[PDB]
Design a protein around this ligand. Structure first.
Ligand SMILES: [Cl-]
Lengths: 235, 244, 111, 250, 231, 243, 240, 195, 241
């Protein structure tokens, strides 16, 4: 075999590159940032109809002002979320304030390269971290197992990502309303998903300064799905 | 580094089997056969010694049958040296239980812990598994007489009659044929010896190539006695059933 | 037996107005009935418009100020040069002090 | 740095064999012949002293070693491996027995401890098995005289008489014809010398043969008097002169 | 080939391929430039995005009030190494009340990188660093390579197409070394230097990153509308 | 085969190929030398000027251990710094326990045992440097050269790097022409000449000369770098001899 | 300590040791969970190449983790004991600190976390086990059924099966289980569970185990005759 | 803490334990239950150092419940008492020993017999027809030496216990706020509400 | 075939790494020889200084382990010095722990035991050296004991090591066949040194100058090496007879 922390001849880490392939097999997750809030949406993708879909948990709260969506080997995300929550709460204990979204993201990314011969392999999951703080407002971050994170205005991860990202390149502008972003996530998810999108196999969420991070009901998302179908037929 | 020389003893095959466990079982299938039979009034342990030499000291010898405590014994098939490591652990475990609760250890509890140690060597540590299969024969006041077997995987099961080591397939078929539930110890002694006699790779079964033991309530009133048979006693029991 | 504590005397005082705050302290430093220095300042500018004094055992006072000053430096390094608010400084100093709960900094602290 | 070899170097092959143990036994086969014979009132262990150079002093190299006052050991295979096993064996007789019970271990139990040490070299991380088979002869009050063989695997077997190494197959057959359960110690010494001559090629005298007995207590070898219960070692190494005396009436 | 499995193996010609592969990650990185006069030292960096929806990966990191660096290659490795420098600068201040000499900062990075090239299990760092600072012997510029090799220079550049800026600075040497007491001119020279490494893309407002340290200037970074002055 | 893939493995010859491969890394490096003299030692090294942008005099390669020992090396420069860092730790602990500064033979074996240790296991790599070092102790002057295997000897003169053979030939002439001994100031000049003569084997890039010395009379037994007037005088002596 | 990274990524992005652990599960005896309106039923196949077994003492296929939650599995038997022991210890630890028994979701989340840890720790191989965990939360009458697997992922199921030929019995359950109307009684739920195993098993003799969990720590295992009555009744309705 | 008593009769073990929790010059509670059920037929009462008592009790309870779930079986009162003794015998040479005294009342279902064990913080175990910890014993032992018979009914045991509480309420310096009484027999553990 | 890279058994029960370490022994192309007198033990070894730039006084394969014990090494100098430092440390500790000077044979056994460990443990390579220990033991008298990479050790009447060891060995054998004794029957160590050089000359067939040899002598209470002039004095004495 070969060392876990080995470089390829092109100057890349084999294990990090291979974990990126695992993430491409994951279910689609989309995030869009506006000046009214950040929306996070995911494809649930139940493997069988007997599986109770509301037990699929791919959107998760980190703190009141920070939420998170995942794609890839989702079991790998549990300890990442556990670290994120502890980092967020610990900072509030030490400083009597909310931790910045970027600082949270940097803390999670510090775990990433802590593998070798520390854990035995990189994480097989990518994270979309969305939140609000007083300094830099509404923010969306893409956290990779490489230890790198980029800020995004909008971003898709998973199997439908490169098609969904090209769509997000055309649709996003700096004046989108929250409602406009909600519909846009639903629209683009419906495009890249295999099975037909409804309230049971897709999930929406948002973070706003006023109400914090909220996962939407299946009833609330169903009405946004109906509002979307009516608007596309209306021209 | 040293990665080059690592056999990776604790990994799965593409089929979902544990290489080293499978190969250890293959090793055990060449060891001398051992049989356990559970009757309503006791248990029989019978085992065949591995091809003997005439100059071997037969009486002061122990290879197959070991005493764990006054109520539990084991029959061994595999590497003896590996078995003694495990037997000493089992002996200590029994005494720990007795020291803690002031009661003799229930058979299954002892069997589970010994099996759990084996399991560990197949999941972590990069070491080869123990090349040993045990037949446990014992008594406690909850289930009475019990037979168990454990193997290198750390999996254990309970039996009315069972064989380990060489020719288990033929031995099991023969035991399945003549065993019945209302059987007595002296009937079980005969079945055990008859089965080994028919499955043996030797020319003829003699006293010097056998170890024998019984666990009876055949002491005096409500208590259990372990009898590890002496050479002459095996010679007599072999004549009494007309094998020699 | 070795006594790890001493008393360097002096006194400090803080008052807050509507759009300002003062932190005063005398400059005398003593041990027993002797004067060590007539001018040894114990009120310090720690950055981010925070002034601090830790009065009592000067060795502990200096050690604490030194650690908090260093804490302000790393707060910038770790949180994109964000200004450390006075309430956040207070909470941070609590942890600096309580971390030595069973071998305390022998000081009264005012920021 | 540090021992990165925390994994087993002896593993099961598809056929079930433990390669390194098999290969260790092969090393034992190449080794010079040694033997042991059990009499009614004693035990004899013997071997050839294969000299590496005529400039070497073969008295300075002892193949037969005292373990306790009543237990001795000889081997076939790799000398260095044997030497460290003797060191370890002598220590374990103290640490795990004498320091606890105030007396020396019985033969079967010391043998058991040596076997454990050899078993662990078969399973532990980053070690090869020992390349030796041992023959351990000894006496103890409740078991009398006994003779054991310990193999690279860690297995041990009690013997009336046996041989290990180069010409073990022929030597075992020779011993089967001559051994009976009424042999007196002097008769066993005689048979030991006869059996060894078959496997020895060059010089056959008290300087090329090493031989020790487990027999009667030797008060003259104790080094002190005044304690009635201490009567001296039963282990004794026969001198070069004592061997030649018996080689005339051969 | 057979000798690139780990850092602990020499090739038959005496090469360390894992170290060479780490060097390759720097070459794929976005270009960054370093240059100095006798009064100031200046970093200029071209930032890289994932697409038009993403931010531009920050290349410059502050180490102390008098020191900082720019990066090309694996960014998490730069975070580890910069954090180490931050501690070493900090230790020097707390224990000796002394600002860490930019030269010692180089020696410390060299020795940290080296240890990862001689032991089993580890890997070389996959990032190149340009360290600038102003200390008791004036302005300085250092080049760090993850082989362990640290080099003091008047000017330099690392990353993709760094050879253009490196040639330019080699020509401009006699001019820019005497830009004393003029920050905006030393930056202009660095911005012209990095322009010799551009292809199809030009320097925009959320694309350019400039840092400066000197005699009466703490290490400070300029992004966004603060670099519009220099386009 | 495959005997060369892992450090500490003996080939059927009885060789450690990984060490021999480290020697190739040393032969690839720039030239460095050592000259032993009347009451001390002199060290010199070739510094290839890769670019105009290198600040002159500011990438120092000769290193001091304690206050009386100098070290120079050819090959992987970081590996040499690791060895000197250990050398400094060894010298400090010797001075801590025994008070007196570490004798040069004692110091030589400290480095030797440490380098030899990196040939004992497959989990470490041998050092990619040959190191020339020495100084003045209570028994006078000593010069040493240490190789990747851990092998070292005392030397009248020593050379390693790409121009080692050229430098060795030049060193042998000095030993033959001066049986009584060479003076410290003379040895500095000769070092400059030899580095210039050994530069012929690396003549694409031009270079920068660096010299240091320890002498009982000239530097009071302490390690000092040769700078300014004494350096330029030594450079000029060398320039006159190549033409 | 033995450090080797045994679970690593391959070029295509798979962790083969985790995927091979799933093959061990596929080899194990079939296990099925079906939840009714007021109960959950766990059914388990037992292979019949083993006659002369002693069923009094042989480890049962369904284990009690606490008085209100049960765990069945498919795969390596020895591996499952380690998971069961850890689960039982966490059960008592939760009662000690929270002063309330575990929820079925929490107990499942813990078991899945343990499994995940063995997929990115050095020196260990993943568990060759998938589990079905069923029960009722304290003071709650809503039935709960969860499934875990070697990777560490877990989810809730109206009905689910694992082990050999599980794809056949999943097929059966997918057309025979109505989400709008789950088996309204205990009898209905046991029957649908027994029916699903009879698609794969062989003889309905000593090959099928059935355990019924009702609210408030009401767990009982059915005997041979009780199960045999379901087998007898199902076959007579089939001949039609 | 303070008063814990135990009486073994023909068919049951009866445990009485004081209800007061006093700290300083304040009775903080008058309804405290100084007992834990270790298994269906085994009950343990406890008295001693504040904090230590409940912490030890619940730790033992967790271990016995863990055993019960593992083996699907209830340990005998003798076995449980030996486990508890060993834990205290370990504790007494720790850096900080548990300062807890316990009584264990159980009904052995295999023997069909009640059993009462007295164990102090040192790990001193004795089986007794009647037991007490602390100053209580100085009044109750002599009283029970006189009035106890080995063949008494549960009702006779309760009257015998009333006599003990009455004596303690007359001669003890502190107000212990009465007792909670619990019976351990063939049918398990139940609490007498009107005492 | 990874059984040839680490110290595990080959199918034929061999340890190739140990065997190859024996071949490393002759890498220096130097021959050594040891003999015993009545009062002394003399060890001699060839000294080849090929490079003119070497300081010849620092080129040595003979080591003073303790005041009483000397050791000559056959093999590469890095491994040689590794063995020498350990031997010195071991001999120093023995004296501190047990209150008397470590005997030559006991140090030999100890160093042989360490060598044995490297043949059994995988992470440690054998040292490619053969160590010859010499002394005048206070109990056993003049002593020669020799260690190899296999962990083997034994006492000698006399011994030789190196590429041309067999020639020297038989030469010595033939002398002791003639003399009928275990040693050199000589009073002074000076003549035992002379015997040693004489019989090395005959066996190797080469003449030696004062700088082609290296001599260590062990007497009661001290082991010492000879200077070039001490050897020259010895070479003159041989020539004038
Ligand atoms: Cl030793």
């Amino acid at each position: 075999d070969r060392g876990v922390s080995t470089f390829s001849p092109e100057g890349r880490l084999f294990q990090v590159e291979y974990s990126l392939e695992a993430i491409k097999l994951g279910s689609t997750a989309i995030g869009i940032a506006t000046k009214e809030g950040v929306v996070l949406g995911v494809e649930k993708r139940a493997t069988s109809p007997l599986l109770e879909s509301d037990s699929i948990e791919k959107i998760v709260e980190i703190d009141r002002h920070i939420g998170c969506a995942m794609s890839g080997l989702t079991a790998d995300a549990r300890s990442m979320i556990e670290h994120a929550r502890t980092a967020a709460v610990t900072h509030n204990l030490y400083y009597d304030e909310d931790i910045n979204v970027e600082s949270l993201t940097q803390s999670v990314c510090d775990l990433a390269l802590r593998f070798g011969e520390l854990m035995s392999r990189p994480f097989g999951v990518a994270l979309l971290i969305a939140g609000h703080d007083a300094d830099d407002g509404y923010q969306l971050f893409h956290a990779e197992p490489s230890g790198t994170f980029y800020r995004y205005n909008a971003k898709a991860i998973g199997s439908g990502s490169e098609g969904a990202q090209a769509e997000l390149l055309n649709e996003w502008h700096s004046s989108l309303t929250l409602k406009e972003a909600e519909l846009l996530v639903l629209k683009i998810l419906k495009q890249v998903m295999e099975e037909k999108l409804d309230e049971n196999n897709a999930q929406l969420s948002c973070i706003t300064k006023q109400d914090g991070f909220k996962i939407y009901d299946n009833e609330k998302t169903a009405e946004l799905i109906k509002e979307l179908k009516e608007k596309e037929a209306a021209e | 580094g040293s990665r080059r020389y690592d056999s990776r003893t604790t990994i799965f095959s593409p089929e979902g089997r544990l290489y080293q466990v499978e190969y250890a079982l293959e090793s055990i299938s060449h060891a001398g056969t051992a049989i356990g039979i559970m009757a309503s009034d006791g248990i029989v342990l019978a085992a065949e010694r591995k091809v003997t030499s005439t100059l071997l000291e037969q009486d002061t010898s122990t290879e197959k049958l070991y005493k764990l405590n006054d109520k539990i014994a084991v029959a061994v098939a595999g590497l003896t040296a590996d078995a003694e490591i495990l037997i000493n652990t089992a002996r200590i475990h029994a005494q720990n239980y007795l020291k803690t609760y002031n009661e003799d250890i229930p058979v299954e509890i002892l069997v589970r812990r010994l099996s759990d140690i084996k399991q560990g060597y197949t999941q972590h540590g990069g070491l080869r598994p123990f090349g040993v299969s045990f037949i446990y024969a014992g008594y406690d006041d909850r289930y009475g007489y019990q037979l168990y077997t454990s193997n290198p995987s750390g999996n254990y099961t309970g039996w009315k009659a069972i064989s380990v080591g060489a020719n288990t397939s033929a031995a099991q078929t023969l035991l399945q044929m003549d065993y019945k539930d209302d059987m007595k110890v002296d009937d079980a002694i005969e079945l055990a010896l008859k089965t080994l006699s028919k499955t043996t790779d030797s020319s003829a079964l003699t006293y010097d190539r056998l170890e024998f033991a019984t666990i009876r309530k055949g002491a005096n009133d409500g208590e259990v006695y372990q009898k590890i048979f002496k050479p002459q006693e095996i010679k007599d029991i072999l004549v009494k059933t007309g094998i020699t | 037996q070795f006594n790890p504590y001493g008393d360097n005397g002096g006194t400090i005082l803080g008052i807050a107005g509507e759009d300002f705050a003062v932190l005063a302290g005398d400059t005398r430093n003593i041990t027993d009935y002797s004067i060590n220095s007539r001018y040894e300042p114990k009120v310090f500018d720690c950055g981010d418009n925070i002034v601090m004094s830790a009065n009592g055992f000067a060795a502990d006072g200096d050690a604490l100020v030194k650690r908090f000053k260093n804490s302000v430096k790393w707060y910038h390094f770790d949180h994109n040069d964000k200004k450390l608010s006075i309430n956040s400084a207070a909470r941070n100093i609590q942890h600096l002090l309580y971390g030595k709960r069973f071998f305390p900094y022998y000081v009264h602290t005012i920021i | 740095m540090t021992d990165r070899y925390s994994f087993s170097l002896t593993t099961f092959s598809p056929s079930g064999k433990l390669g390194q143990i098999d290969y260790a036994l092969t090393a034992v086969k190449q080794g010079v012949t040694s033997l042991g014979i059990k009499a009614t009132n004693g035990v004899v262990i013997a071997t050839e002293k294969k000299s590496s150079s005529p400039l070497a002093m073969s008295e300075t190299l002892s193949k037969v070693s005292l373990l306790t006052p009543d237990i001795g050991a000889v081997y076939s295979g790799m000398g260095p491996d044997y030497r460290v096993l003797v060191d370890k064996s002598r220590k374990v007789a103290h640490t795990s027995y004498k320091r606890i019970y105030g007396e020396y271990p019985p033969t079967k139990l010391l043998v058991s401890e040596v076997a454990k040490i050899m078993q662990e070299a078969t399973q532990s991380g980053g070690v090869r098995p020992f390349g030796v088979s041992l023959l351990i002869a000894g006496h103890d009050e409740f078991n009398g005289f006994s003779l054991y063989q310990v193999d690279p695997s860690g297995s041990y077997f009690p013997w009336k008489a046996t041989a290990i190494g180069k010409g073990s197959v022929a030597a075992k057959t020779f011993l089967e014809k001559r051994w009976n359960d009424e042999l007196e110690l002097e008769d066993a010494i005689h048979i030991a010398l006869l059996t060894l001559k078959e496997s020895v090629e060059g010089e056959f005298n008290g300087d090329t043969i090493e031989l020790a007995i487990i027999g009667d207590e030797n008060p003259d070898l104790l080094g002190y008097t005044g304690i009635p219960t201490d009567k001296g070692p039963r282990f004794r190494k026969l001198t070069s002169q004592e061997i030649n005396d018996r080689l005339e009436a051969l | 080939n057979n000798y690139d499995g780990d850092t602990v193996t020499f090739s038959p010609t005496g090469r360390l391929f894992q170290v060479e592969y780490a060097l390759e990650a720097i070459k794929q990185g976005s270009v960054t430039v370093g240059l100095r006069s006798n009064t100031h030292a200046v970093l200029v960096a071209l930032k890289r995005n994932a697409d038009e929806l993403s931010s531009y990966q920050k290349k410059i990191i502050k180490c102390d009030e008098h020191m900082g660096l720019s990066l090309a290659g694996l960014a998490p490795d730069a975070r580890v190494l910069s954090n180490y420098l931050r501690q070493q600068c900090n230790y020097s201040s707390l224990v000796f009340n002394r600002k860490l000499a930019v030269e010692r900062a180089g020696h410390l990075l060299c020795d940290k990188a080296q240890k990862n090239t001689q032991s089993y299990g580890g890997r070389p760092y996959g990032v190149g660093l340009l360290i600038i600072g102003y200390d008791k012997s004036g302005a300085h510029l250092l080049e760090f390579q993850p082989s362990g090799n640290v080099t003091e220079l008047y000017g330099t550049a690392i990353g993709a197409r760094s050879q253009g800026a490196k040639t330019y600075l080699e020509r401009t040497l006699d001019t820019f070394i005497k830009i004393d007491g003029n920050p905006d001119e030393l930056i202009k020279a660095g911005v012209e230097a990095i322009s010799q490494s551009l292809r199809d893309e030009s320097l925009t407002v959320d694309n350019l990153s400039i840092a400066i340290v000197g005699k009466d200037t703490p290490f400070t970074i300029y992004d966004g509308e603060a670099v519009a002055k220099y386009i | 085969t495959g005997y060369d893939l892992s450090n500490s493995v003996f080939s059927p010859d009885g060789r450690n190929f990984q060490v021999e491969y480290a020697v190739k890394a040393v032969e690839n490096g720039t030239t460095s030398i050592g000259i032993k003299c009347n009451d001390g030692v002199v060290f010199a090294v070739e510094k290839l000027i890769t670019s105009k942008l290198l600040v002159p005099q500011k990438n120092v390669k000769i290193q001091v251990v304690d206050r009386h020992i100098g070290c120079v090396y050819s090959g992987l420069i970081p590996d040499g710094r690791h060895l000197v860092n250990r050398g400094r730790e060894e010298a400090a602990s010797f001075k801590k326990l025994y008070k007196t500064p570490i004798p040069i033979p004692a110091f030589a074996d400290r480095l030797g045992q440490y380098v030899q240790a990196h040939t004992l296991y497959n989990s470490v790599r041998p050092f990619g440097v040959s190191t020339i070092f020495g100084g003045v102790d209570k028994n006078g002057a000593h010069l040493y050269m240490l190789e990747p295997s851990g092998s070292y000897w005392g030397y009248k003169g020593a050379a390693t790097g790409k121009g080692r053979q050229s430098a060795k030939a030049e060193l042998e002439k000095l030993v033959d022409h001066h049986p009584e001994g060479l003076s410290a100031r003379e040895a500095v000049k000769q070092a400059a000449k030899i580095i210039y003569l050994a530069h012929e084997d690396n003549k694409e890039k031009d270079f920068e000369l660096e010299i240091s010395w320890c002498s009982l009379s000239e530097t009071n037994g302490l390690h000092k770098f040769v700078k300014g007037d004494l350096l330029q005088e030594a450079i000029d002596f060398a320039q006159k001899e190549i033409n | 300590g033995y450090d080797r990274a045994l679970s690593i990524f391959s070029p295509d992005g798979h962790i083969f040791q985790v995927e091979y652990a799933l093959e061990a599960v596929k080899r194990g005896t079939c296990a099925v969970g079906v939840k009714g309106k007021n109960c959950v039923v766990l059914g388990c196949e037992r292979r019949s190449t083993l006659k002369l077994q002693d069923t009094r003492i042989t480890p049962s296929k369904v284990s009690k983790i606490d008085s209100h939650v049960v765990l069945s599995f498919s795969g390596l038997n020895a591996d499952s004991r380690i998971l069961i022991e850890k689960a039982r210890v966490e059960a008592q630890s939760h009662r000690l600190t929270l002063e309330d028994p575990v929820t079925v979701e929490y107990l499942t989340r813990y078991v899945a976390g343990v499994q995940q840890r063995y997929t990115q720790s050095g020196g260990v191989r993943p568990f060759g086990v998938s589990t079905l965990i069923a029960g009722f939360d304290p003071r709650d009458d809503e039935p709960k059924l969860y499934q875990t697997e070697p990777s560490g992922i877990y989810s809730s199921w109206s009905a689910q099966t694992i082990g050999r030929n599980s794809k056949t019995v999943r097929e059966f359950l997918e057309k025979n289980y109505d989400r709008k109307e789950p088996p309204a009684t205990v009898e209905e739920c046991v029957k649908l569970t027994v029916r699903s195993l009879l698609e794969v098993v062989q003889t309905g003799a000593k090959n099928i185990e059935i355990t019924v969990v009702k609210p408030d720590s009401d767990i009982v295992a059915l005997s041979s005759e009780e199960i045999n009555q379901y087998v007898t009744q199902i076959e007579q309705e089939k001949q039609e | 803490m303070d008063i814990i008593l135990g009486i073994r009769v023909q068919d049951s073990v009866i445990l009485a334990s004081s209800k007061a929790v006093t700290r300083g010059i304040s009775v903080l509670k008058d309804s405290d239950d100084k007992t834990r059920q270790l298994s269906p037929h085994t009950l343990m009462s406890f008295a001693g150092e504040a904090g230590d008592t409940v912490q030890f009790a619940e730790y033992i309870q967790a271990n016995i419940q863990l055993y019960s779930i593992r083996e699907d079986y209830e340990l005998s009162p003798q076995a449980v008492s030996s486990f508890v003794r060993q834990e205290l015998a370990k504790s007494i040479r720790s850096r900080r020993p548990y300062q807890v005294n316990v009584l264990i009342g159980g009904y052995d279902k295999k023997k069909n017999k009640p059993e009462l064990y007295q164990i102090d913080y040192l790990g001193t175990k004795v089986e007794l027809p009647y037991g007490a910890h602390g100053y209580s014993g100085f009044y109750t032992f002599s009283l029970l030496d006189h009035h106890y018979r080995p063949d008494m009914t549960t009702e006779e045991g309760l009257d015998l216990l009333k006599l003990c509480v009455q004596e303690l309420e007359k001669r003890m310096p502190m107000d212990f706020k009465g007792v909670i009484v619990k019976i351990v027999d063939k049918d398990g553990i139940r609490q007498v509400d009107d005492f | 075939g990874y059984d040839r890279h680490i110290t595990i058994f080959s199918p034929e029960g061999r340890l190739y790494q140990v065997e190859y370490a024996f071949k490393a022994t002759n890498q220096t192309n130097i021959n050594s020889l040891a003999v015993r007198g009545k009062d002394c033990t003399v060890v001699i070894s060839q000294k080849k200084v090929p490079d003119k730039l070497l300081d010849p006084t620092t080129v040595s394969y003979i080591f003073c382990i303790s005041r009483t014990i000397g050791m000559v090494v056959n093999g590469p100098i890095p491994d040689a010095r590794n063995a020498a430092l350990r031997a010195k440390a071991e001999a120093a500790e023995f004296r501190y722990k047990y209150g008397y000077d470590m005997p030559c044979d006991v140090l030999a056994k100890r160093m042989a035991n360490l060598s044995q460990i490297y043949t059994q443990r995988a992470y440690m390579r054998p040292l490619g050296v053969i160590l010859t220990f010499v002394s005048v033991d206070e109990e056993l008298g003049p002593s020669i004991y020799k260690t190899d990479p296999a962990g083997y050790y034994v006492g000698y009447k006399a011994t030789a090591t190196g590429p041309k060891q067999q020639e020297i060995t038989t030469n010595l054998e033939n002398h002791f066949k003639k003399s009928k004794i275990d040693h050199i029957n000589e009073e002074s160590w000076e003549k035992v040194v002379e015997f040693a050089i004489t019989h090395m000359i005959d066996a190797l067939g080469t003449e030696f100058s004062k700088n082609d040899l290296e001599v260590g002598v062990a007497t009661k209470d001290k082991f010492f090496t000879l200077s070039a002039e001490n050897i020259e004095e010895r070479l003159v004495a041989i020539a004038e007879q």
